[PDB]
């Protein structure tokens, strides 16, 4: 089919957008589009559209013309445009009508001349839409990450002017690439940003309270400053954790559900006898399994078929129950979870156990 | 209009439900419903419906009948039912067809005979739908609240079997009424339940860290176990609070927004020089005002027209701005809030201040 000038314009702009990387590198191979001039029969079938096709190309210096003999259809020998060829990037950009976009791209590109041009061009998609101020901030941030490698600092501790956390996160992939470039690392550099926040809550009896503080929440990293505990009681439910009294030599730990598995990776938790009390449901047993995966001498409390049998009348159906296998449960815990399964996937929350009964069973287990 | 038997049944049941309190008290005044027998003309216009009306009442001992003379319409003297009268609660309940509901209501009511019958009947709406087990638990809970007045304990510390927090809350108004009854208090008793709310977060320099713990979160009640601070830096935004370094003799406190006003009620906060750093918006200044309402020597940091003037280019419009007057701001803070107002209700979040600049201004203010 005949390629009209509007169609060539569209294809040229589409190609320009498809090869933005190469053009910024000066790697323009040229674009050649055949215009497919009408056959004699088509020229005779629609004389006016064929005239329009030819007229749209007349007088262009980048267009090849050829004489076709249409004498059999009464038009005689007529010169028709056959092919557009754009050899230079300037010809493409002026033809594709993208001069302002190209100038803005080169201006932004030139602001990035401190980095490898090849890498910049390959990821043009990351920066073509940024403001010049955003680019200047980006350069400043890259220098900051090069001067403070593995800072371990929170995203907020990047003290670069105009750089707030939401902005730094939004362009993060670009920053990682540019840090990799300056470091000579492939792809994306580790920024060495931190997250901190590894926290755990502990309660003490007044005789053991560090500096007399009987209820503290600390980062896991500070646990080495404490006296080693003889007994740790980890409690999943917070309300049960808070209602318990405190005992000499016993550190009470809040398990915070599944967070228990990450918490027990701290050496503090292996230095004592670890007792765990969770929910009587799938999730409590899965947390117990994960805890023993790091501290195998973990003893369960109130997570036995005897307690289940007593308190199942307050159980509700666990709505999310999916049979999962746990490798680190003892037989009596497999028996208790199976017992919860068969009564209709029961969940017996810790809060349904009478606090005094839980205290009595805990005291029995702790005393040995 | 003639009242058919179905309509009387409906009205009797509706009345029964409307006076449930009085019936349980034996205060049944009787129900009298006039049946409005047809006039001669209506009896003649619809002979069959009139026959049905009469037939539905025939043979009932509680129905008054009267002879109407319908001879002018060819029916002669005909006896017609004129009025239903139910004098006893049994007649009403059997007629209203609510025997099972009435028996269940009295059984539940008899379970409440330990309390004033009048009060129980007046609030029948609170208990008619409970199970007998829920009633037994309620009695046990009432005895618990009578034996532990002003316990200050959390809802979870109610160690009554089968009573969990969600259940105790769902029936709470009923429990308060019953405790009031046994206490001889009008209406609803204070249960004397607590909320054990507090929680302030503190960071220390390593030389001041209690037992070497440099980042702790404690209940406000534990603050008396700490050494009195020389300087407190309260920070509203958490990310700024965490990114700051720690200084000798300086305790950094997390203000947690509006929670700062309740936190500073602790004597710990008056024992030192209290510095506050909040957001540059309406909320930060309102928190500062509330803080000084308890600790008048509170000094603001970075909440001045100089800092505003420098960082306003990162401000955004505060969308919830409502002109509020604050009594405890100093003139330079009124000037800074007014400056935020006039540039279009700006919010300049703490995270937009360069961390090193905030550190420098904080260090200047702390050093004096």
Residue numbers in the entry:
A (entry chain B), B (entry chain A): 21 to 388
Task: Reproduce text from the manuscript describing this model.
In strong agreement with these findings, we have previously shown that in the Gram-positive bacterium Corynebacterium glutamicum the MksBEFG system (a Wadjet type I system) is indeed involved in plasmid copy number control. Our data reveal that MksG is a novel, divalent cation-dependent nuclease that effectively cleaves DNA in vitro in an ATP independent manner. Our data reveal that the plasmid defense mechanism by MksBEFG is executed by the MksG nuclease activity.
MksG is formed by two domains, an N-terminal (N-ter) elongated domain formed of mostly α-helices as well as an elongated 3 stranded β-sheet, and a C-terminal (C-ter) domain with a central β-sheet, flanked by α-helices. The C-ter domain forms a dimer in the crystal by extending the central β-sheet. The N- and C-terminal domains are connected by a flexible hinge region. A structural homology search using DALI on the AF2 database revealed that the C-ter domain is homologous to the topoisomerase VI (Topo VIA) domain of the Rec12/Spo-11 meiotic recombination factor. Structural comparison of MksG with Topo VIA shows that the TOPRIM domain dimerizes, in the same way in both proteins, to form a DNA binding groove and allow for double-stranded DNA breaks. Sequence alignments and the structural superposition with the Topo VIA subunit of Methanocaldococcus jannaschii show a conserved position for the magnesium binding residues essential for activity. The N-terminal domain of MksG is positioned in a similar manner to the 5Y-CAP domain in Topo VIA with respect to the TOPRIM domain, but there is no tyrosine candidate in the equivalent 5Y-CAP domain that could have a catalytic role. The only tyrosine within reasonable distance for a putative catalytic role is Tyr258, located within the TOPRIM domain. A modelled DNA molecule could be placed into the putative binding cleft formed by the MksG dimer and the distance between the two active sites could be compatible with double stranded DNA breaks.
